[PDB]
Amino acid sequence: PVERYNILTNPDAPPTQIQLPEVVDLYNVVTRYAYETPPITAVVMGVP
Amino acid sequence: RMGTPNVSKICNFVASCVRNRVGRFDRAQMMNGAMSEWVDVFETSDALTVSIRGRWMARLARMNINPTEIEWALTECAQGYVTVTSPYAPSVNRLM
Amino acid sequence: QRHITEFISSWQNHPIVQVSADVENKKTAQLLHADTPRLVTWDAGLCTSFKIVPIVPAQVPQDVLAYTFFTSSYAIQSPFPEAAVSRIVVHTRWASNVDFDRDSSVIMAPPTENNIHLFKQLLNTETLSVRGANPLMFRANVLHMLLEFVLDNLYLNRHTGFSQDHTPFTEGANLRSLPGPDAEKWYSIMYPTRMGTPNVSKICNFVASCVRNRVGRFDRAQMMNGAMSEWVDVFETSDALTVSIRGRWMARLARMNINPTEIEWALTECAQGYVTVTSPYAPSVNRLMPYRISNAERQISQIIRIMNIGNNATVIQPVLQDISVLLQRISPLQIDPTIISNTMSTLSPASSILGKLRPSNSDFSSFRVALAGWLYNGVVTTVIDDSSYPKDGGSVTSLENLWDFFILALALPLTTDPCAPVKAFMTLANMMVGFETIPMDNQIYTQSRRASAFSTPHTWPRCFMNIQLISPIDAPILRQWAEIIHRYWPNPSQIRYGAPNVFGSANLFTPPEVLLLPIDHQPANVTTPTLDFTNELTNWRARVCELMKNLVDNQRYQPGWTQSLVSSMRGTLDKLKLIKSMTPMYLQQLAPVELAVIAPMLPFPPFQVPYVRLDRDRVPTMVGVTRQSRDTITQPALSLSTTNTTVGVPLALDARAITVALLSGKYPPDLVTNVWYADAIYPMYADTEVFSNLQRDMITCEAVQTLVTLVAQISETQYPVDRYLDWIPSLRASAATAATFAEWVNTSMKTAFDLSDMLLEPLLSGDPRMTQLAIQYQQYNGRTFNVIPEMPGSVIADCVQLTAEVFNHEYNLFGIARGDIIIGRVQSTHLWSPLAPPPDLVFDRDTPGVHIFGRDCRISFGMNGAAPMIRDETGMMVPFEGNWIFPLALWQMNTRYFNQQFDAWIKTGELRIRIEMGAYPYMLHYYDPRQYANAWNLTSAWLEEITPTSIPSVPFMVPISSDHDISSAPAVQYIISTEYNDRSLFCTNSSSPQTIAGPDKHIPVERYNILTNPDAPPTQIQLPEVVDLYNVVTRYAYETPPITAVVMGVP
Amino acid sequence: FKIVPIVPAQVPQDVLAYTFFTSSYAIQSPFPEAAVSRIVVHTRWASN
């Protein structure tokens, strides 16, 4: 199904365009995050 | 990436697919000694699970708090009996 | 010769000699720690990397075998190689002779042998098979190969003697003698003119045709040592490119030359005239002392040094430690806290403080460290633990806390911390809470807030910022303290340092000749009176003591005391206040003189930034570095300096010990400062390693410049570099890939100079493709200072560009085959060469109906007689016939598939396909024309070796050379090149005077233009098209003296 | 979601050269090679 691979099948098609809910694309551009989740004691220091 | 010596339906479909939409789409790389916090890339996948995860990230992003805010809060709670301190530096991406 | 430096004192019989640490006999002598290569070399052998090889010897009939002179007969021997075909081969410095080796020599095997390892020497390390290399790595490999050739050629030609000759033609004539044996064989090669040519032959005709004048020593220096001239000019076989490169290296040495008298004057200035060193130098005609350099090179090196520190306090600790040891034995002053204890002669507040002090420890390393830190102001920070301050902020009623406060007040001025005044003020406010009131502008920050939290100017309180804003009534003691601090706050100082003639200074954030100090200094005078309140420290101590006395006067601050301690407290404080410590006096005069002497002594130039004692807005916040040129726009990324907020490394030290030292300083009673300092300096001057450090720094600078230029050469960098070999295949490497390739080139360079030490390791973190380095620091108000040095060029880079152009002209001699070849089986009776096949047989590039195929062309398949047809670029499947153009990549992508589709067509099909090759290394195989030849099996093997990652080594089959007509037999070859590639062949059948049959190659007149053409001037070159392999050249002899100083007492 | 193969093709056959089929070399393909195949939901089938 071209609709399921539209991002590749159509060069003119926008990367973010979706065919939902008519067709579920099986090839997608994905954003992966490396944001840190450090402990408060790591950056916040108590001073006597 | 598959080659198409054959004229098979798979070969024809691959030939139809855009050649250039491959590899990391984009990345957060520019600051001195800063690796990309996030990167965009084209790959096989499904948007709907990606959408669910995106909403989860959105809610978590909605709840995030910053270290300076925490320093002020702890110091205020101490009321001068206790003192805590936080440094000032460029955003390094910490989820609180 | 092991001794490089000799020092002799006149007032003591203790001469001192310094030698390189690399020597095997360090008996009672100083050594050279830095790892350093020997850049200058002398050569006993020919600097030749290329030798023509004659493959097959030949025979010509001669009735008489000898020259006719008297009754004797002389045999005829050709210096020229005898072969049906002869071609040059690569062996860098093959004819050179030296004890020391660059260990970078390159020997190239004959075309019949595989040299794939050299072609894939660099990034092709990740190759499935040793045979075969990825083409896109080829450009990087070629560039590195040229670099190695240049490094291997870094030598100087030693002047050599000439000898009377015993060969009959020039018997008794003087011939410069090559080392040991073969000199006559060498003579025959340089002067085949010496060889007679009685028989008639192509070689003989050429020798007879040659001009007699282009031979022998061109000229000699009239000045000479014994029978040997200082310099000479002679005609002999050589390559101009290498000679030119060596000339550039020599030119760099000529610029670097430095003079001893300048050194003597500079040494006297550094000594400040303390002692007279004697360094008169006997003049040397060839005297060489290359020590001329630029402060800009030093700046680049120091930026590298700062990156090398790279946030490691541990690395700085050792230099500071050695410096402190020197200061400890470079100071004749004595510290006596026990004397303070004896003067005291001791519930007692004095007893409490004494128990707290435990003054028994006699170590003052921290004090010396503090002086060293003052020297490195920019990279050094003095910090104090809050725990050093009174627990819980101290208590107004605590006498022990009062002792802590007094010691803290004494060391508070000492702290280099800029916000330290704010912290001390906050500390006093914290103790004062409930007695004096301090207003806070911000609710979040409290009067009891720990001062250490206020480590920065932006946290300085507005109430704190204006004394008038605070009510004097609210905190009158505090108000007075603020006024007194303003009235008596300590003054830091700047002192002149460095010598312009030679060492100079590369200071950027600070004036180059000025040394910054956190302490004001004054002219030295031991006779000065002890009670001088003009001394800042004395005045500060007095004011602080009186202020404390006023505070404790009513005892309002300390209720709960059954007895009044005012009289006793006042006496103890009075004794401390009136102490005539000379430590401030020593720091004011003696410390500056000593620091000034040690500054040249310091191995590493200190890093400092301007001192702003009260300039809060102008206080700098941090220092950062940039790798790219200003014009470029790029993502800002994380850097090591940003992580550390502190500009300088933080140091926390024991306040009590420092305060006690400050209260306990005395000089030796009969000490002669000039004598003590001179005695210490003489050995210290005798042990200096400055020259070696300068040499390593200069090498590092050359490497850095070469690296930036190379980064632009193989990658996208703003720095301009000419690329004529972009045709040479290369991909766009990721920044990481380029960095790894760079790391391999760097390891190669270190091994090439035999470097046991790290090179540019801070530079090896990343961002090799950096257009311009820049470094800057900013103030709390936000003003900033940016320092950018001017790039100094590298001899290697210019030589590289010249060689690159030479390679482009000589790549066939270089052995890489440019262009593509056409696939066509061919059988013929003609004499045309494999490199010169019939053009009509080949379809030319500008031909109609040739077929190129698009990426989408899956071939059609026929089952049970159905018609398979190759999908065309146009998308029409076609039969396997015609002339086609195939991109090389497609075959590698589908090598098995293509072979399968055309295997019958390949073996017997007439279809001709052109695969675009552009350039490639080639392999040559000689073949016999008079016997049946079939490459079809060979072609099948080569195609199978074709693979997606890379393709098999190109095999060429050529006929064996012959000087006479020969029969031929059918031969099948499917490989057809599009061009003649036989320019590498020096000559064919040279033995024959004329060619009976086949292709003919003759000795090149242009390469022998000086001998071949009389009109041509002796110094004429035909580069890059024609390379003469023999030319007139100059060899000279030079002398370098050892460092020697004779030290005498100054009047 | 992962695609699944439903019906195999009638291969090999005498008229059709096996050399024609890429799958005959057992070359890895992006999609299943079969007479019938349909997409299937398999939650976290490839997740780690």
Swiss-Prot record, chain C:
It comes from the Viruses. Its cofactor is Mg(2+); Mn(2+). GO terms for molecular function: ATP binding; ATP hydrolysis activity; RNA helicase activity; zinc ion binding. Belongs to the turreted BTV-fold inner capsid family. Inner capsid protein that self-assembles to form an icosahedral capsid with a T=2 symmetry, which consists of 120 copies of VP2, with channels at each of its five-fold vertices. This capsid constitutes the innermost concentric layer of the viral mature particle. Homodecamer; each decamer is made up of two conformers of VP2, called VP2A and VP2B. 12 homodecamers assemble to form an icosahedral capsid. Interacts with protein mu-NS; in viral inclusions. This is Inner capsid protein lambda-1. The lineage of its organism: Viruses, Riboviria, Orthornavirae, Duplornaviricota, Resentoviricetes. The chain holds residues 217 to 1275 of 1275 of the full protein.
Curated annotation (Swiss-Prot), chain D:
It comes from Reovirus type 1 (strain Lang). This is Inner capsid protein lambda-1. Homodecamer; each decamer is made up of two conformers of VP2, called VP2A and VP2B. 12 homodecamers assemble to form an icosahedral capsid. Interacts with protein mu-NS; in viral inclusions. It comes from the Viruses. The lineage of its organism: Viruses, Riboviria, Orthornavirae, Duplornaviricota, Resentoviricetes. Inner capsid protein that self-assembles to form an icosahedral capsid with a T=2 symmetry, which consists of 120 copies of VP2, with channels at each of its five-fold vertices. This capsid constitutes the innermost concentric layer of the viral mature particle. Belongs to the turreted BTV-fold inner capsid family. Transmembrane segments: none annotated. It is found in: Virion.
